[PDB]
């Protein structure tokens, strides 16, 4: 047959969500391509309205939720071809927020999705250039204004990738970011996009401190440490400092001074892999996946 | 007036116009390269039977 | 919108890069209009606009040797240029010069025009020029091909046409050849397997002199390219390009076809096989 | 140069790239300009039009951050044009449009513009309001400068300046911040070793409410990203940036500067720190 | 905005015009925050010792 | 310290041709240094005259010669080294060249250098490029023709390389390729340049007759594919084979069917060492290495 209409898309995704989100942890690879038709089979009919807006919107949404329990129940799902459709999905919402504006509609949910936006790629300046071009109304949403804290937050003049342009006077505030992590106020699916870049944020943050200890300092306490980036407990410590050569001392402190690299992503090694902050987890718990994926109003 | 670069057009759809030869016309024994060749053709056949 | 002489400016700017010996820092343009925004855009300028702009991109594609690529480009043009409103002594003028590379492109792609709807563009002695080109290719004259170069070599090297041509035409010129040979070998004398001592003196005679066969001796890429002693190979290249369906046994000497009545079983139409292994779309201004 | 209108045609162009809001397109226009060919004409078309190409190869690098960058051009574009009759609307108004940006581009790299030479080109409006967050970034006041923003946010919105001051004005005022402090605690009172606990009193006075303190219950981005709770990050960052030359001591929870009058040793000054480890090229035109 | 954008110049070295300040001081005087500076700079002083 | 100047740095490059050609199989790094030294010095200057040409034109000879040499001893030297400095002289001997024809004047060896230029990149379409919009007399010098010929026959419409975009209707004329190569007439350092071509020329050849081959020909003789590829020797084919992962069988053929990669470049498997033409060399030994430098009119 042709292409499936609006209304039974939508249908079909409430099916995902009403009863195969429990089953996430293994083989979202499924939910992935039967998600990735409905964006495509809307897309395809050239259909731009709310069933899009709406399904979109939680397809991102589950994409977030999937980010967290893949790496909390570290089951392998990808070296994250997922970021991909997460982008693809939101550049394809940012467009249907653009003509609806431009139609003199409203999307009730934008911010939200703007915010989201903001933290995909989070030193692109690109991002902080077009939020500025929105609707004073939308640029000064909680959740968007939260996500240009962490994109200020997050930025340091010490970054090292390749390809990468170091700009002038950045924070580095990784004392405000595991701060903002930690509060009640921020939106849960937000702070799983943002456990993307704890392993970065931390080893700057290291390599920021470790600077600034003159020569004979006494190696510092692994508890100092685990309180300021927010560690889940002694053994990632420990796991974090052999991962980049931080040698220890008394399996009870670091000597920062032997840290020793430039970048956080080293010679054609395996990336550490993803973590997680237990704040969440928690959160999480206390909570329903299928709950989180219907945050927000409705189209 | 000369160069490959295009004139001003001044200042101010039906598709068709097929301007591909579709098939050929022309007659293959008036052309004298072309009858060498079965001329030759025929030499090797007679020989090399 | 609000950037109505873009499409102009760009066009101003690129054939400026032209005029300089450095049409390679036109991409960068070039490639500014695949931006989602823009690409819908392309359509809404004037057409003698896009006209131009084809043109360039076409003459683009050529200086990096990606025929069909270039083909597609000049077909948009000069077929937008045909059901042109006007007609002034400059539109047409426009269309001789997309002629003049539209021409040599559908060659090498195995296209060969109708010079009905041309000739209120081109020169009947044009015509006859390309003509005379259009029939040596047709009938595999290899020897007739490069002559035709080695005349016309001095303003085909001006319009970077010369190189393009003596490497792109061969191997349709070759098709061609072998097709004669094939038709009348294996469809009308029913003989399955072909003899590489037959392609051989089939070759010698299209090909002619070689480079340091008697008489000819400096090297020359009209004489020093092409020589009748490769057959195994002008075959393995033709087969390659899926322009003849057959096969070689090096030690026994043969090339092997399929036995058949109908001519276009072995040596499918050139043009279609080309395009199928080098797929180009209209819509990819870059 | 040759094909005078080049540069002409370039800045036509970009400035388009802009009006419909993809001034990233115009990297690609930029880039043309680095072959050692047309490097070398780049200073031979009209003054004018350099010096419109650096001002918006300007605006274009201070979109990506790159401050210094954004500096050079602002700088040279704004020195060439006072060499023009500074008589006429179009000149001085377009001197006006160039500072718009080269003042706050100057400010985040420690650089006051001197409001003699700006007073024909600038409002006292203008020149007042750009005069207090001079003040507040000088006397380290965070509060001061995050509520200067604040109360600019649409324009400088529009002009794309908000973001780049929210976040790289900051650690500017840290500097002078730590600075004042720096001098009566150590150059007056002999007192080379800072205890965080001062330094905390200190940023709490400059810093004002933060997010989830008593009557500051939703985030803005004025009041989210600086708390006097995190002492040491921000002395570690100013150390990192080589604007501070100390040593910290988590343990001992203190920080410790050299021993001295002199305090240019321990507080450099903040421009020739800054440009030093990010150096930057008039004769980059990309 | 679109007045953000070069007007057309008109039609037909001297170096200088040092339009940048040298240091930080001699910018207006802040009572309010650097009187309330200092004040804490010297309860510190004379408390903690 | 002092940059030397041009009457004398002519007489640097006399002795090191009259003198230490001869110890070249090993005196190559320190013959490098010396010539790269030559170079520099001379456009410390901003000298372009019959000096600056003179020493450059018999550097790139010099470093033509330098090929061969190394890679008939085993003496494995720098991989790309010699090539790109053999590219920063044409580079400037080429716009040297440009200049010269500007103002009026000529340089009795461009054609020579031009053809080289022609064999550095002889799969881009740049140089058929430019080479199209010189002098006639220099397009039709015997030196460019044989120059374009051989990149005409190397053209390959299956030749894969990561970024290389194929061009259709190319000629893989392997065959008339190694015709050439035993010419009489063909310049003799040319011919050290076009050998950095054997292996891929080749097994483009190869992979193109597998596939005329109808599935259960029965293998291909040595005796024989040292005729269709020039080998050097029985050994060395058999070596190639062992490469590619084609087969050998009974000793005396192989099994082209057995070849199954797309390219010439396997995925990480550093390249087959490069190889020569047992009658280029030998062409080689009854002249001398300066000879082959000096050789050339004078400016």
């Given at each position: 047959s042709d292409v499936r209409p609006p209304h039974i898309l939508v249908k079909t995704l409430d099916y995902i969500v009403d009863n195969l989100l429990t089953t996430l942890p293994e083989s979202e690879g499924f939910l992935w391509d039967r998600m990735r038709s409905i964006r495509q089979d809307f897309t395809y009919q050239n259909y731009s309205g709310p069933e899009a807006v709406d399904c979109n919107e939680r397809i991102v949404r589950i994409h977030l939720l999937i980010l967290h329990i893949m790496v909390k129940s570290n089951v392998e799902f990808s070296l994250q071809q997922e970021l991909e459709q997460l982008h693809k999905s939101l550049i394809t919402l940012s467009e249907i927020y653009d003509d609806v504006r431009s139609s003199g509609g409203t999307c009730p949910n934008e911010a939200e999705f703007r915010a989201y936006a903001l933290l995909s790629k989070i030193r692109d300046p690109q991002y902080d250039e077009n939020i500025q071009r929105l609707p004073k109304h939308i640029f000064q949403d909680k959740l968007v204004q939260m996500a240009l804290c962490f994109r200020r937050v997050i930025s340091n003049s010490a970054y090292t990738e390749r390809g990468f342009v170091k700009t002038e006077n950045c924070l580095n505030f990784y004392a405000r970011f595991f701060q903002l992590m930690q509060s009640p106020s921020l939106p849960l699916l937000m702070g799983f996009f943002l456990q993307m870049h704890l392993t970065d944020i931390r080893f700057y943050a290291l390599r920021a401190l470790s600077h600034t200890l003159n020569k004979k300092h006494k190696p510092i306490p692994f508890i100092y440490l685990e309180n300021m980036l927010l560690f889940n407990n002694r053994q990632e410590i420990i796991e974090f400092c052999n991962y980049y050569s931080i040698e220890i001392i008394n399996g009870d402190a670091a000597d920062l001074k032997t840290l020793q690299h430039y970048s956080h992503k080293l010679s054609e090694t395996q990336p550490l892999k993803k973590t997680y902050l237990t704040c969440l987890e928690r959160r999480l718990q206390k909570t329903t996946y299928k709950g989180l994926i219907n945050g927000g109003e409705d189209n | 007036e000369e160069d490959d670069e295009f004139e001003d057009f001044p200042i101010d759809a039906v598709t068709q116009t097929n301007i591909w030869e579709e098939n050929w016309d022309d007659v293959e024994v008036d052309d004298d390269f072309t009858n060498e060749l079965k001329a030759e053709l025929d030499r090797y056949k007679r020989e090399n039977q | 919108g609000k950037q109505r002489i873009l499409l102009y400016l760009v066009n101003k700017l690129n054939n400026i890069y032209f005029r300089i010996?450095?049409?390679?820092?036109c991409s960068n343009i070039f490639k500014n209009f695949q931006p989602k925004s823009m690409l819908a855009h392309f359509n809404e300028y004037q057409l003698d606009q896009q006209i131009e702009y084809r043109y360039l991109l076409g003459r683009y594609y050529l200086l990096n040797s990606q025929v069909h690529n270039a083909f597609v480009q000049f077909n948009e043009a000069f077929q937008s240029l045909l059901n042109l409103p006007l007609t002034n002594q400059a539109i047409t003028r426009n269309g001789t010069r997309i002629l003049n590379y539209m021409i040599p492109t559908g060659l090498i792609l195995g296209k060969m025009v109708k010079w009905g709807p041309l000739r209120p563009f081109l020169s009947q002695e044009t015509i006859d020029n390309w003509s005379v080109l259009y029939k040596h290719v047709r009938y595999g004259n290899i020897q007739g091909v490069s002559l035709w170069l080695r005349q016309n070599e001095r303003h085909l090297c001006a319009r970077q046409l010369l190189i393009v041509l003596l490497e792109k035409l061969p191997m349709v010129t070759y098709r061609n050849l072998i097709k004669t040979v094939i038709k009348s070998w294996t469809t009308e004398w029913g003989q399955n397997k072909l003899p590489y001592s037959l392609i051989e003196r089939v070759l010698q005679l299209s090909i002619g002199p070689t480079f340091e066969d008697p008489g000819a001796q400096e090297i020359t890429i009209y004489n020093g390219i092409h020589s009748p002693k490769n057959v195994e190979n002008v075959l393995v290249t033709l087969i390659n390009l899926g322009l003849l369906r057959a096969n070689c046994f090096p030690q026994l000497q043969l090339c092997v076809v399929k036995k058949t009545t109908m001519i276009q079983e072995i040596v499918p139409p050139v043009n279609e096989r080309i395009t199928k292994m080098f797929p180009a779309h209209s819509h990819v201004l870059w």
């Open positions: - | - | 010996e450095s049409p390679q820092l």
